[PDB]
Amino acid sequence: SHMLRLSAPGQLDDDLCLLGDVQVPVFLLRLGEASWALVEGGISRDAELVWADLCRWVADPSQVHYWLITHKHYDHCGLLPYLCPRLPNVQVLASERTCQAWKSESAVRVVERLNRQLLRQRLPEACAWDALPVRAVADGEWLELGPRHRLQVIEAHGHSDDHVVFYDVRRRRLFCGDALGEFDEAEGVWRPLVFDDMEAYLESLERLQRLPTLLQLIPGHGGLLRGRLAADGAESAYTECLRLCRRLLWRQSMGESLDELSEELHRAWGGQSVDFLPGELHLGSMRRMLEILSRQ
Ligand SMILES: CC(C)(C)CNC(=O)Nc1ccc(NC(=O)c2cccc3cn[nH]c23)cc1
Ligand SMILES: [Fe+3]
Numbered sequence: 001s002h003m004l005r006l007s008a009p010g011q012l013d014d015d016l017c018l019l020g021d022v023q024v025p026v027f028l029l030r031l032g033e034a035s036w037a038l039v040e041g042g043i044s045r046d047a048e049l050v051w052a053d054l055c056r057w058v059a060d061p062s063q064v065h066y067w068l069i070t071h072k073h074y075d076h077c078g079l080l081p082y083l084c085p086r087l088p089n090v091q092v093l094a095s096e097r098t099c100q101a102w103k104s105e106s107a108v109r110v111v112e113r114l115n116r117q118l119l120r121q122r123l124p125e126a127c128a129w130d131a132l133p134v135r136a137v138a139d140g141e142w143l144e145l146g147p148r149h150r151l152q153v154i155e156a157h158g159h160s161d162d163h164v165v166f167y168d169v170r171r172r173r174l175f176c177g178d179a180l181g182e183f184d185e186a187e188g189v190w191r192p193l194v195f196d197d198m199e200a201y202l203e204s205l206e207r208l209q210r211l212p213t214l215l216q217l218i219p220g221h222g223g224l225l226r227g228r229l230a231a232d233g234a235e236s237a238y239t240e241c242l243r244l245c246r247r248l249l250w251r252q253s254m255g256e257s258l259d260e261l262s263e264e265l266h267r268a269w270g271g272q273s274v275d276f277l278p279g280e281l282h283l284g285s286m287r288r289m290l291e292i293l294s295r296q
């Protein structure tokens with residue numbers, strides 16, 4: 001209900017729709033009269049929901065030509081095996097390390113296990129992960145998606161070691177995945193998601209702050225941010241991460257164990273993701289983040 005946060009399914013801009021669940025959304029870009037792209041790859045159990053929404057906008061799904069992926073986490077690529085078979089002309093665009101994850105039997109195994117925990121139903125017939133129609137893309141690569149859509153790949157490691165963002169400079173629009181963290185709907189601030197490397201996470205935010213002023217900021221969860229939330233997004237995310245480090249140091253300096261802020265963080269932050277993230281995994285991830293901050 002905040003005017004700066006668009007969090008409803010359907011049309012978001014002249015060229016853009018939100019498909020599926022706002023908390024794990026798939027974004028639809030209209031590239032031309034007969035060309036479309038998807039951005040973010042969701043959770044597996046949403047295959048039929050997202051497919052249903054897609055077909056309400058796109059009369060012929062063979063016109064879906066690209067599918068852009070920020071990182072390899074199970075909640076950002078779980079749909080790929082289940083929907084790519086229904087998209088004969090789609091090319092999945094992911095970073096090198098993200099593509100490597102789909103060639104790893106053990107990595108794919110974790111992804112499938114996490115996604116099956118979210119099943120209420122049984123999944124569509126899936127192609128193999130290693131058989132996905134992928135094309136690796138590089139840091140700085142320009143994605144000429146259509147006559148009015150040129151997006152630059154920008155490496156944004158720290159949340160995960162493969163993470164990238166996509167920047168539409170015509171629209172000052174950044175698809176930032178989880179590199180800024182989890183947007184707090186009740187409080188209007190970023191919650192950090194430092195799950196791989198704090199130093200890389202903070203350096204990505206420094207670089208993203210140097211982009212031309214954002215008009216639209218589109219993370220991996222929660223919808224589209226605009227106004228000052230977009231303009232100040234990368235900076236605020238940086239600030240909130242330092243705020244979490246200071247908090248961690250304060251408590252450790254009082255002899256607290258990492259388990260204590262972990263439980264408080266899980267209590268205070270675990271509610272937002274309970275529909276796509278098992279509660280033990282949220283607590284575990286909070287523990288892992290504090291471990292990462294504590295070292296670095
Ligand atoms: C990468 C592989 C080896 C291939 C295994 N694959 C995975 O996907 N592991 C995995 C990924 C993400 C999460 N997430 C979170 O804990 C979390 C917590 C709060 C908000 C948000 C918003 N997004 N995520 C979160 C947990 C485990
Ligand atoms: Fe993630």
Ligand SMILES: [Fe+3]
Nearest residue numbers: 073075178220
């Ligand atoms: Fe995520």
